[PDB]
Amino acid sequence: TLVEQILAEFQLQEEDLKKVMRRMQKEMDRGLRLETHEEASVKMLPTYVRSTPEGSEVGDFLSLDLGGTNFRVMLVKVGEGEEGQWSVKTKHQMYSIPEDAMTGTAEMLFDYISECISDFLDKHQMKHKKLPLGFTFSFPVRHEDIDKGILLNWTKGFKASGAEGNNVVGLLRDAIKRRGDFEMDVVAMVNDTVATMISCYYEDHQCEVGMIVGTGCNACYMEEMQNVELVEGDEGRMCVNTEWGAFGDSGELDEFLLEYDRLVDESSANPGQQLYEKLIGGKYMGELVRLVLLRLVDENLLFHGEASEQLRTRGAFETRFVSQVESDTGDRKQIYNILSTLGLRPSTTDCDIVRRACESVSTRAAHMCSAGLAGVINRMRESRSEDVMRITVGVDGSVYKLHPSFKERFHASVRRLTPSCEITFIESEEGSGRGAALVSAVACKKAC
Ligand SMILES: Cc1csc(NC(=O)c2nc(Sc3nncn3C)ccc2Sc2ccc(F)cc2)n1
Numbered sequence: 001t002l003v004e005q006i007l008a009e010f011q012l013q014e015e016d017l018k019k020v021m022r023r024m025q026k027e028m029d030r031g032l033r034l035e036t037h038e039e040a041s042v043k044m045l046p047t048y049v050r051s052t053p054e055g056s057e058v059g060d061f062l063s064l065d066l067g068g069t070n071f072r073v074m075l076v077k078v079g080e081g082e083e084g085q086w087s088v089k090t091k092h093q094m095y096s097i098p099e100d101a102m103t104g105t106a107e108m109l110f111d112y113i114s115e116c117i118s119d120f121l122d123k124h125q126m127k128h129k130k131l132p133l134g135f136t137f138s139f140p141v142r143h144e145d146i147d148k149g150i151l152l153n154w155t156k157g158f159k160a161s162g163a164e165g166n167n168v169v170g171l172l173r174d175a176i177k178r179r180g181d182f183e184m185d186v187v188a189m190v191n192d193t194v195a196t197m198i199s200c201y202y203e204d205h206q207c208e209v210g211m212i213v214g215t216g217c218n219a220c221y222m223e224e225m226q227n228v229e230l231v232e233g234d235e236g237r238m239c240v241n242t243e244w245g246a247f248g249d250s251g252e253l254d255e256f257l258l259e260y261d262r263l264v265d266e267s268s269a270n271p272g273q274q275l276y277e278k279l280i281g282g283k284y285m286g287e288l289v290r291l292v293l294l295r296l297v298d299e300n301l302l303f304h305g306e307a308s309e310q311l312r313t314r315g316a317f318e319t320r321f322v323s324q325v326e327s328d329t330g331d332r333k334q335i336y337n338i339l340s341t342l343g344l345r346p347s348t349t350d351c352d353i354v355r356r357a358c359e360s361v362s363t364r365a366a367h368m369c370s371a372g373l374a375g376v377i378n379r380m381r382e383s384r385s386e387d388v389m390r391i392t393v394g395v396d397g398s399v400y401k402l403h404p405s406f407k408e409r410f411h412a413s414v415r416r417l418t419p420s421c422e423i424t425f426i427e428s429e430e431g432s433g434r435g436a437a438l439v440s441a442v443a444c445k446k447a448c
Pocket residue numbers: 048049050051052053083084085086146197198201202203205206207208209222438439440442443
């Protein structure tokens with residue numbers, strides 16, 4: 001109970017979720033209107049991907065995915081299916097980004113990318129060949145069009161200098177021609193939320209929302225063009241990138257924030273930014289548990305009040321440990337091994353307490369996230385006039401997919417928040433690469 005009292009600070013009651021949900025909805029309305037879009041914590045970024053596309057090129061596309069710790073390059077075949085296009089990933093390669101490539105400059109970093117792009121084409125006897133390129137770029141962009149937008153700021157710990165405020169598709173077309181080697185048509189830059197959503201479209205036309213819960217956390221959804229005030233027009237729909245990670249940056253979550261959150265935030269690459277994402281994202285989840293653990297050792301409640309050197313270092317409680325702790329079957333061997341690897345020697349009760357600390361943090365992430373998506377879905381409910389709104393959500397990300405109970409918890413809570421909606425969840429297969437291509441495919445019918 002001294003332990004359980006510390007942990008019970010993580011609880012959220014239903015009315016707390018409803019409050020977060022309504023505030024999210026308010027913020028979303030603000031980012032859409034011209035008079036408030038600029039100060040809005042929830043950016044609601046038009047993406048220029050639009051409804052009833054009809055008219056796709058077929059064949060082969062190059063997909064890049066940048067936003068993970070590791071950059072990826074892959075080849076995707078789009079072709080012709082019934083009432084839409086099929087797609088399949090055929091070749092792939094993943095590339096690490098070195099400490100020096102990151103902390104450098106954007107043009108530096110975008111060379112490293114073009115390098116990897118050459119590297120990849122060499123290995124597949126394709127360097128001669130010229131294909132449309134799908135770019136999945138998982139960071140907030142203000143788009144002018146489907147193939148043009150400026151990065152607003154880096155998130156999830158990225159930090160290349162001289163990239164913020166510049167045209168990303170610009171930065172890439174540049175560096176692909178400090179190469180001469182190869183030439184791609186850069187037909188479409190998308191967010192990873194948008195890509196996952198599109199990657200599920202062929203199998204389910206009701207998929208109108210894309211969610212990521214991985215390193216970072218965010219969603220996009222199909223919005224009515226009359227509500228998209230930042231894009232001229234009233235006919236049809238356009239996907240909006242909510243960028244809901246930055247919910248709380250105007251102080252909307254201040255009553256919920258705990259000490260561990262103010263610490264994670266204060267020592268992050270982006271102090272004061274991405275507050276909501278910091279409650280949920282796998283970049284921050286293990287760190288939260290760490291701090292909760294260090295709190296517990298300080299009150300002398302855990303490890304006899306003695307912490308290891310690993311435990312006292314940032315980043316050392318990896319999010320994947322949280323998830324592995326919660327897969328422990330009851331014998332404590334997974335917990336013991338993780339803690340032992342961290343230079344600790346837990347007792348039976350130290351183990352049980354580490355488990356509970358993990359559950360506390362990841363259950364609050366599930367619930368917080370559930371209110372976000374209930375916000376998006378109930379907002380869209382207003383513009384639908386069926387008895388039950390049947391909607392499909394495409395989802396990706398290792399927190400959602402692999403944490404043993406995250407998705408169950410998430411599902412039940414979202415359902416509780418969204419009466420008269422019947423929500424179907426699809427886990428995306430090669431969301432990023434196959435969705436970037438599918439959209440490239442469609443934007444080709446115009447820019448080719
Ligand atoms: C201006 C512009 C450039 S690309 C673009 N739109 C797309 O590429 C696109 N958009 C949607 S919007 C939507 N409507 N209801 C729900 N969803 C999500 C849906 C699909 C696609 S591609 C596709 C098409 C068919 C298929 F089987 C698989 C992928 N507009």
